[PDB]
Amino acid sequence: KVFGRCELAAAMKRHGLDNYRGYSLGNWVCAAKFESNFNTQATNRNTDGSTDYGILQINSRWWCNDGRTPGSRNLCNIPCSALLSSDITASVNCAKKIVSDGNGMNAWVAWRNRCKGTDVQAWIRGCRL
Template sequence: MKQQGMDGYQGVSLENWVCLAYYESSYFTYAKNFNPGDQSTDYGILQINSRWWCNDGKTPRSHNGCNIDCEALLTDNIYESLKCAKRIVKDPLGMSAWVGWRNNCKNKDLSEFIKGCSLMISNSSFYCYSLCKATSTIQQKNRNHPS
């Protein structure tokens, strides 16, 4: 995420992007969730919606704002998801376009999401974030519930 210029993009910190991915998909790049209300589906690590942002060929009245096939968002290479997220966050809703971010990340201390992470660990540095978040969550639980 940092390598793709997400830290500070449109004023959004890296911690917010990582928190978004955590609450939207649990860092699962192949996540796909159907929304029966409007017949749309959310795709990928950032759960990008087919009503507004991508084309899945089945969502009624799809806008395809990112001009991308939704299936391209279901991959371990998150470049296309990040590119689309940059488009989404420019809209008036900004990060609030994502319910997971609104409900869990907005106006919160998110330092735990990157605490102890080396941002230069590898080319797939996002993997580091999920490990760091999982590690810090486990460490916190262990502090709160000693054996």
């Protein structure tokens, strides 16, 4: 499922991402925009063998089990395929564990490179939130 910008904003807000760990809703939408282009089915294989899964490109090295990343952790205790559902609940729940990991949203390279310090409010603009 390729979310609309405001649709994803509403889903993330409903799931508790708005100001989760002090990151306003626009940060998550922006992160999701540049991680996955709002596509829940987005997958990207990293060079270390791990794969980023879903609307938030959650990595199999630490957070989800895809059965093909030796030495992984699966800290969100989910199959990585659960991060690709049209329902972003698993991605959000896992994102909360990721953003609470210590580095905040810097865990998302796209957020740090393309959303951090930008006018992330623009991403929830015009959204009936």
